[PDB]
Enzyme design. Structure first.
Site, PDB file in Angstrom:
ATOM      1  CE1 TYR A  38      -3.264   2.374  13.934  1.00 25.24           C
ATOM      2  CE2 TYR A  38      -1.933   0.838  12.595  1.00 25.24           C
ATOM      3  CZ  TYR A  38      -2.036   2.020  13.353  1.00 25.24           C
ATOM      4  OH  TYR A  38      -0.949   2.826  13.537  1.00 25.24           O
ATOM      5  CG  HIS A  40      -4.896   2.110   7.840  1.00 22.54           C
ATOM      6  ND1 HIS A  40      -4.268   3.341   7.704  1.00 22.54           N
ATOM      7  CD2 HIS A  40      -4.219   1.481   8.862  1.00 22.54           C
ATOM      8  CE1 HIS A  40      -3.283   3.396   8.619  1.00 22.54           C
ATOM      9  NE2 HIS A  40      -3.204   2.291   9.360  1.00 22.54           N
ATOM     10  CD  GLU A  58       0.418  -0.178   9.414  1.00 20.93           C
ATOM     11  OE1 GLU A  58      -0.187   0.909   9.292  1.00 20.93           O
ATOM     12  OE2 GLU A  58       1.490  -0.352  10.036  1.00 20.93           O
ATOM     13  NE  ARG A  76       1.682   0.008  14.394  1.00 18.57           N
ATOM     14  CZ  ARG A  76       1.900   1.201  13.813  1.00 18.57           C
ATOM     15  NH1 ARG A  76       1.902   1.339  12.477  1.00 18.57           N
ATOM     16  NH2 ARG A  76       2.114   2.275  14.583  1.00 18.57           N
ATOM     17  CG  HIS A  91       7.149   1.208  16.615  1.00 20.99           C
ATOM     18  ND1 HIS A  91       6.483   2.390  16.912  1.00 20.99           N
ATOM     19  CD2 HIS A  91       6.655   0.813  15.405  1.00 20.99           C
ATOM     20  CE1 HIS A  91       5.635   2.634  15.898  1.00 20.99           C
ATOM     21  NE2 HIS A  91       5.690   1.703  14.946  1.00 20.99           N
ATOM     22  CG  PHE A  99       7.875  -0.611  11.968  1.00 17.47           C
ATOM     23  CD1 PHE A  99       7.370  -1.672  12.734  1.00 17.47           C
ATOM     24  CD2 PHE A  99       7.040   0.469  11.625  1.00 17.47           C
ATOM     25  CE1 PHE A  99       6.035  -1.666  13.163  1.00 17.47           C
ATOM     26  CE2 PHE A  99       5.701   0.479  12.056  1.00 17.47           C
ATOM     27  CZ  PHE A  99       5.202  -0.590  12.825  1.00 17.47           C
TER      28      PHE A  99
END
Length: 106
Positions: A38, A40, A58, A76, A91, A99
């Site tokens: 991350y 990416h 993300e 996120r 999550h 998600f």
């Protein structure tokens, strides 16, 4: 980026903006602030997409400040390849690996 509540974990418009302005400065062309992956490119797959263009990437958040890498990282924030906020997913209210959308994100 206007006060997103990721199920239970609340994030101020200040936190969403901080993490995104950070993710932005890092993913453009200035520094490789730790990270295994991350930030990416949030490439392919169904389930989630944002009403923008991308290619979006993300940036996993934390309820303290910008990128630490504590783990888990259900919550996120996700941005566009410039500096614009795409959405916020988590999550928290999902089925472990899956998600769900935070407040504003759908």
């Amino acid at each position: 980026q206007s006060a997103t509540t990721c199920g239970s974990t609340n994030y101020s418009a200040s936190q969403v903006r901080a993490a995104a302005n950070a993710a932005c400065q890092y993913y453009q062309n200035d520094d490789t602030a730790g990270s295994s992956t991350y930030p990416h490119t949030y490439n392919n797959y169904e389930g989630f997409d944002f009403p923008v263009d991308g290619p979006y990437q993300e940036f996993p958040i934390k309820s303290g400040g910008v990128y630490t890498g504590g783990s888990p990282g259900a919550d996120r924030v996700v941005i566009n390849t410039n500096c614009e906020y795409a959405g916020a997913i988590t999550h928290t209210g999902a089925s472990g690996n899956n998600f769900v959308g935070c407040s504003g994100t759908n």
